[PDB]
C-alpha cells in the first residue's frame, strides 16, 4: 500500500508530514543509519509536494539526503570546535 497524493489529502497538514516521514525514514536509514532521525526531520521542512517527488525519485532523494548530511556535519563541526 504505497502513499498517494489523495491519501495525504485526507489528512491535517501535521499528519501529512508524519505520513511522509514514515515512508521516507526507512530509505534514509538505509543510507545513513546513525543520522536517520535527524536527517528525516531536516527533510520534513520541505514542501509536501516536493517530498512526494522525493519519494518517487530515488536520485532526487539521494541528492537531498547528501545535502542534509553535509549541512548537519558542517554544523556539527562548528559546535564541536
Amino acid at each position: 500500500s504505497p502513499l498517494t497524493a489523495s491519501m495525504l489529502a485526507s489528512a491535517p497538514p501535521q499528519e501529512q508530514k508524519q505520513m511522509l516521514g514514515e515512508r521516507l525514514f526507512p530509505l534514509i536509514q538505509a543510507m545513513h543509519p546513525t543520522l536517520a532521525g535527524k536527517i528525516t526531520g531536516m527533510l520534513l521542512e520541505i514542501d509536501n509536494s516536493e517530498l512526494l517527488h522525493m519519494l518517487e525519485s530515488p536520485e532526487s532523494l539521494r541528492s537531498k539526503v547528501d545535502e542534509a548530511v553535509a549541512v548537519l556535519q558542517a554544523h556539527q563541526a562548528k559546535e564541536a570546535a
Binding site: 525514514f25 526507512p26 535527524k38
Partner: peptide, 16 residues
C-alpha cells in the same frame, strides 16, 4: 534550505 536545528523525526518503528 535545510536547517540542522530541525526537530528529529520519530518513526512508528525502526524495523521500518
Amino acid at each position: 534550505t535545510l536547517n540542522p536545528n530541525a526537530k528529529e523525526f520519530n518513526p512508528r518503528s525502526f524495523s521500518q
